[PDB]
Design a protein around this ligand. Structure first.
Ligand code: GTP
Ligand code: GDP
Ligand code: MG
Lengths: 49, 432, 98, 252, 427
């Protein structure tokens, strides 16, 4: 039982943590920065014009 | 298969084991109705064919209101119908009734169920007694059992967590007699006597946790966590685990020294934990400050003799060596000549599980010191002092003579305390 | 107050994760070659002296005759500097038999 | 005294090199595909393939019919360790064989009825007559076979130590099973009748004359978490009829 | 050309041999499923030294794996290497000794010795030609120092011909971990002298230096520290397992190191250590390895080697090298400081060569030394001993299971006369 818990789900969960944190950082950075910067700059220039 | 058959004696024993067995059923998947990776719950929890785990310890009280309140509480389906033992009359603050009549009438069902537990076990290490110096059931029944079990099961570990009466403040009038008599009858059949108080925990529950007006039910979980970080080494895995024999062989130097002091370091609440930084150094320097002892004594009037740092949680094992190395460079922490090593460290990694909505937070590093000190002879001086003022008038003695025991125990129970303090004075000196 | 405080708690599941992570905080499982490996990662680097000097007949892609004397460091290196490591390791037919 | 990961205090530089090399090695392993996640997901997707059974034009079973093996829920009170209902026979590798709490055809469930002495790929099956049960792993495309040998002193089952049942590639006579009726006064009248699809029939071997069983009392923790034990030992009562442990049903 | 029988005990030794029996698995290309998936036909040559065979081509070690507690035996075969160790080579009780030497050496650690004695002769008579007996343990508790150093007196009853080599762990000077160390340290040193030949002394204060000052980490732990000891082990016997230029062995090492019937206490080292930042900025050649293996900071014991002298110095090398640059740098270091060698012996440093370093290293070395500043490790025990015996503290763990005071007061008269030998030859 100790070998089954400490060999086949341990490493699966840890690698899933690191994969999910890479995906969360990449998606958060691209989506938030692209949306906020693009929408703000475009409608600011339209209102001024 | 490393069980710990525990004993709870008296009103004190059952009222602290409520919260102790609360934590043991809390930290595993154990429901409060028997039902439910790791299989280290078989060291306190048996099985059957329904997955139903039933705890392996004995609760005794001759004053059956607390036991019937347990039997009718939320914890009825879990405890056994038999290892909860009642009477119909209490010993009622005397040593004679508990040691000679009401102990003798019902010591046999206790010893029966102890033998049934001890021959249904496979791997018992020793015996762990939770009892009360200052009452009737926790002193007479206690010393009767600790004669009637040390005559049978022989040489084995015996650790006593003892709810000692307070230094100044008090609850019952004639606690000096019932303290002194059971101390004289426990010193020859103890191995390690861990000592706790009540106002000394009230002080800390006011000044650390900031909750004002607490109860016995708010004091009981601090002992209920102290015992759990004591026993944690069998309970989970670790780097340097601790059996039950190393306390008893690392903490007492001599035949009649064995009275250590307990203390538990990281005491703080939920609103403050997230803004204080739980460092190993700050924990171990809080644990040596004399404002953080569970026994109201000042260590600066004497010398330490032996310690036991027992960790729990995310220990960084280099930092423990660094912390002991910066403890050892102080003059406010003094030591005797004959112990130059003077330390022990035990390790476990599991973080302390804390009860829901309690007065404590989710600490990640638990420290218990169970160290002995020669500044507990000062605590024994007061309960010899009170006896000296009381016996000269021969007050209260008829309650003691009227149930079988003579008056001539009263002289030897003071000669024993005088020789014990003689021992404690002759051990802590230098030799040259 | 007993019936006050001892209300049951369905759903205070203990964590299994901090213990499992302190295990590798102490141990460090893949870390035990990241402690002592040196220079550049390399899987097969190893061969013996009889097999290189005698049977092998020595290095192949190096300079066969030229030993050129360099400018700054005072040295005839391009024979000495190689310290031959050509080809596969010493195989001679024992894994076949066993 | 001690700070976090990114702030430029103390011994940060050697550790920056340290997690740089560990982070790069972990990305190299993920790019190559040698990680436990993607290997495990590929294995489990190739096991749990949602595939289709064959319906029956009548009640009866023919050869070549892709047919689940399932054991019905019992109300038995023999002991208090129990699996709730309708266990099925599933290939549990490490391969091995066990029984799992499922009812859908998912590709480690799906058995093809094959002929050992019979011939035609569609042919009606009868009681007391030998046949074989086939199953295939993903991309192997080779027929496994249900087997069990006469008990020896080294070949015993996992938790119970009875006659064990397993899967093997080879062809023999230790692969042929025959299925009979549970009511013991009518099987000699049922020796040649065709077998209906979802009816409770005993399964027995042909060389040992023992029978395949499900132990609802001891558990096999697997990766899938679903638990039972399979073996072959015929059980009978004090009235000497077969217990509900041994009843099996071949559903379509 | 022999096999090696290797003993392990204590809570220590199965957390050290767990790293030892996996570097040997690394260097012979042994996967943890039992088989062999190495690359050459060089590794398969002397596979017999550490690996018996069975059906299917799998290799299982010669492991002896003993402990009273079942605490750590749940942890060694629950590692990555769990199906490589032998099933019936786990011998245990149920109780745990825990810091006393009475119930290790006489009663509670003792009834399992007949369950270690009759597993050795199952295997150590089935090995065709053995070189001797190895052991790794800690002196600091009750199962290494209680059973192994008891069995060290037991297996030398049978075979005096072979060679005893030891990987001991003496207690640390400054911060200790048990109040009853200078009994279990005292009594097993007096054990070790009569029945052990090359006794290697290892500390954890001297290794928490190396993972801090040298290799520059910020969390040094046990698994980081067990492997530098387990690098030394396979760096010792490099020539009974691989070819080379000048092969040595555990009988070649004893002739060139220990002169005397009683002057047989050693001190180890391991040469090529650096950080993880400066991995490509160093050049792993001979003028770098030799420059640090003699230094005090690269030493695995509580020795300041400048305060005394080395009577003798051993070595080994590995890797495809040349010999002139290892002929003169151990000739310069004998020449540049005659203050740190004794004059009456004409040579000191023994040279041994192999062909292959450990996998990942390019070239390697392993320093082994008989200095006489190893007597600064046995002065603090005898300072701690008699400053405890004078108050007679803790002695009722030591009369309570079969020992006397006469096993005590003669267990320092061996430690006195040891230091009374090492001080004659200091200058
Ligand atoms: N702090 C704290 N003190 C307790 C607790 N239970 C009992 N005590 C103390 O126990 C002391 C003695 O009271 P009892 O426990 O009732 O006395 P006894 O040992 O049971 O003897 P009898 O009452 O005659 O049966 C009192 O001074 C209390 O302070 C508890 O749960 N917490
Ligand atoms: N560096 C290192 N030290 C260890 C290891 N295991 C144990 N120790 C040390 O060995 C001592 C424990 O010895 P002990 O368990 O009491 O000895 P035993 O009774 O023979 O098992 C402790 O002081 C540890 O510091 C390890 O894996 N690495
Ligand atoms: Mg009462």
């Amino acid at each position: 039982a100790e070998r089954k818990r400490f060999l086949r789900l341990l490493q699966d969960e840890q690698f899933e943590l690191d994969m999910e944190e890479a995906i969360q950082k990449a998606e958060e950075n691209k989506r938030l920065r692209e949306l906020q910067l693009a929408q703000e700059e475009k409608l600011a220039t339209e209102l001024a014009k | 298969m490393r069980e710990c058959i525990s004993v709870h004696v008296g009103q004190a024993g059952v009222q602290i084991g409520n919260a102790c067995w609360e934590l043991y059923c809390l930290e595993h998947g154990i429901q409060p109705d028997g039902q439910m990776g790791d299989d280290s719950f078989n060291t306190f929890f048996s099985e059957t064919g329904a997955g139903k785990h039933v705890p392996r310890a004995v609760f005794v009280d001759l004053e059956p209101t607390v036991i019937d309140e347990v039997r009718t509480g939320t914890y009825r389906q879990l405890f056994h119908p038999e290892q909860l033992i009642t009477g119909k009359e209490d010993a009622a603050n005397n040593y004679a009734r508990g040691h000679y009549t009401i102990g003798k009438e019902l010591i046999d069902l206790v010893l029966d169920r102890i033998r049934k537990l001890a021959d249904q076990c496979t791997g018992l290490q020793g015996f762990l007694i939770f009892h009360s110096f200052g009452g009737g059931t926790g002193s007479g029944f206690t010393s009767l059992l600790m004669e009637r079990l040390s005559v049978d099961y022989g040489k084995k570990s015996k650790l006593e967590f003892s709810i000692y009466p307070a230094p100044q403040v008090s609850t019952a009038v004639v606690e000096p007699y019932n303290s002194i008599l059971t101390t004289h009858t426990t010193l020859e059949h103890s191995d390690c006597a861990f000592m706790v108080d009540n106002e000394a925990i009230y002080d800390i529950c006011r000044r650390n946790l900031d909750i004002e007006r607490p109860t016995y039910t708010n004091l009981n979980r601090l002992i209920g966590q102290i015992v759990s970080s004591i026993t944690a080494s069998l309970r989970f895995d670790g780097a340097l685990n601790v059996d039950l024999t190393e306390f008893q062989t690392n903490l007492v130097p001599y035949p009649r020294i064995h009275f250590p002091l307990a203390t538990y370091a990281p005491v703080i609440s939920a609103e403050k934990a997230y803004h204080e930084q739980l460092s190993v150094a700050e924990i171990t320097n809080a644990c040596f400050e004399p404002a953080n002892q569970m026994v109201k004594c000042d260590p600066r009037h004497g010398k330490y003799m032996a310690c036991c740092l027992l960790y729990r949680g995310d220990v960084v094992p280099k930092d423990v060596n660094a912390a002991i190395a910066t403890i050892k460079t102080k003059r406010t922490i003094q030591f005797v000549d004959w112990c130059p090593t003077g330390f022990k460290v035990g390790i476990n990694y599991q973080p302390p599980t804390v009860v829901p909505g309690g007065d404590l937070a989710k600490v990640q590093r638990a420290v218990c010191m169970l160290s002995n000190t020669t500044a507990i002879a000062e605590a024994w001086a007061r309960l010899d002092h009170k006896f000296d003022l009381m016996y000269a008038k021969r007050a209260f003695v008829h309650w003691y003579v009227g149930e079988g025991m003579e008056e001539g125990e009263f002289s030897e129970a003071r000669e024993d305390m005088a020789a014990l303090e003689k021992d404690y004075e002759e051990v802590g000196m230098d030799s040259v | 107050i007993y019936r006050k405080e001892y209300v049951p708690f369905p759903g205070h599941r203990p964590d299994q994760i901090s213990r499992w992570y302190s295990k590798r905080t102490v141990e460090g499982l893949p870390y035990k070659y990241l402690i002592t490996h040196h220079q550049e990662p390399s899987q097969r680097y190893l061969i013996s002296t009889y097999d290189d000097h005698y049977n092998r007949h020595n290095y192949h892609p190096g300079l066969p005759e030229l030993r050129t004397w360099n400018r700054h460091k005072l040295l005839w290196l391009p024979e000495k500097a190689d310290f031959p490591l050509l080809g596969p390791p010493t195989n001679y037919g024992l894994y076949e038999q066993l | 005294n001690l700070y976090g990961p990114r702030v430029r205090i103390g011994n940060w530089n050697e550790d920056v090199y340290l997690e740089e090399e560990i982070m790069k090695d972990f990305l190299a392993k993920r790019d190559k595909g040698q990680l436990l996640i993607q290997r495990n997901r590929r294995l489990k997707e190739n096991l749990l393939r949602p595939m289709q059974l064959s319906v029956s034009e009548d009640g009866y079973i023919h050869y070549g019919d892709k047919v689940m093996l399932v054991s019905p829920d019992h109300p038995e009170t023999e002991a208090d360790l129990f699996l709730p209902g309708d266990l099925s026979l599933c290939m549990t590798p490490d391969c091995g064989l066990s029984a799992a709490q499922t009812k859908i055809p998912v590709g480690r469930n799906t058995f093809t009825i094959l002929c050992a002495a019979g011939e035609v790929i569609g042919q009606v099956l009868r009681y007391g007559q030998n046949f074989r049960l086939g199953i295939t792993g993903g991309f192997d495309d080779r027929m496994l076979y249900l087997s069990s040998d006469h008990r020896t002193l080294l070949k015993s089952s996992k938790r119970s130590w009875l006659q064990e049942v397993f899967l093997t590639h080879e062809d023999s006579y230790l692969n042929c099973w025959q299925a009979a009726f549970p009511h013991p006064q009518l099987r000699l009248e049922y020796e040649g009748s065709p077998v209906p699809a979802n009816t409770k029939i005993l399964i027995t071997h042909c060389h040992t004359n023992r029978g395949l069983v499900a132990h609802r009392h001891l558990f096999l923790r697997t990766y899938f978490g679903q638990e039972a034990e399979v073996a072959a030992h015929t059980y009978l009562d004090s009235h000497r009829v077969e217990k509900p442990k041994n009843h099996w049903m071949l559903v379509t | 050309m022999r096999e090696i029988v290797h003993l392990q005990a204590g809570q220590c030794g199965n957390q050290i041999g767990a790293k030892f029996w996996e570097v040997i698995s690394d260097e012979h290309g042994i996967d943890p499923t039992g088989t062999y998936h190495g690359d050459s036909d060089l590794q398969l040559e002397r596979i017999n030294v550490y690996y018996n065979e069975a059906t299917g081509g799998k290799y299982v070690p010669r492991a002896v794996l003993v402990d009273l507690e079942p605490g750590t035996m749940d942890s060694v075969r629950s590692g990555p290497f769990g199906q490589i160790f032998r099933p019936d080579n786990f011998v245990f009780g149920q109780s745990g000794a825990g810091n006393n030497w009475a119930k290790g050496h006489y009663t509670e650690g003792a009834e399992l010795v007949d369950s270690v004695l009759d597993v050795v002769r199952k295997e150590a008579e089935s090995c065709d030609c053995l070189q001797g007996f190895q052991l790794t343990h800690s002196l600091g508790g009750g199962t290494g120092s209680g059973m192994g150093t008891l069995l060290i007196s037991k297996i030398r009853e049978e075979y005096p011909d072979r060679i005893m080599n030891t990987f001991s762990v003496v207690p640390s000077p400054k911060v200790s971990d048990t109040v009853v160390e200078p009994y279990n340290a005292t009594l097993s040193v007096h054990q070790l002298v009569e029945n052990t030949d090359e006794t290697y002394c290892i500390d954890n204060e001297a290794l928490y230096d190396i993972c801090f000052r040298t290799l520059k980490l910020t969390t040094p732990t046990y698994g980081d520290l067990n492997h530098l000891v387990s690098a030394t082990m396979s760096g010792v016997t490099t020539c009974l397992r691989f070819p080379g230029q000048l092969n040595a062995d555990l009988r070649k090492l004893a002739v060139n190191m220990v002169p005397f019937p009683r002057l047989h206490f050693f001190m180890p080292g391991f040469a090529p250590l650096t950080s993880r930042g400066s991995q490509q900025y160093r050049a792993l050649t001979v003028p770098e390895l030799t420059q640090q293996m003699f230094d005090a900071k690269n030493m695995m014991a509580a020795c300041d080697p400048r305060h005394g002298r080395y009577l003798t110095v051993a070595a080994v090398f590995r890797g495809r090298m040349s010999m002139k640059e290892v002929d003169e740098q151990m000739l310069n270091v004998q020449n540049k400081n005659s203050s740190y060698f004794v004059e009456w012996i004409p040579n000191n440093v023994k040279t041994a060569v192999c062909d292959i370093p450990p996998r990942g290293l390019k070239m390697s070395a392993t320093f082994i030394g008989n200095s006489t500043a190893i007597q600064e490790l046995f002065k603090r025990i005898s300072e701690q001993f008699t400053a405890m015996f004078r108050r007679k503290a803790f002695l009722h763990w030591y009369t309570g299971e079969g020992m006397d005071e006469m096993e005590f007061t003669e267990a320092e008269s061996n430690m006195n006369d040891l230091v009374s030998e090492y001080q004659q030859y200091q200058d």
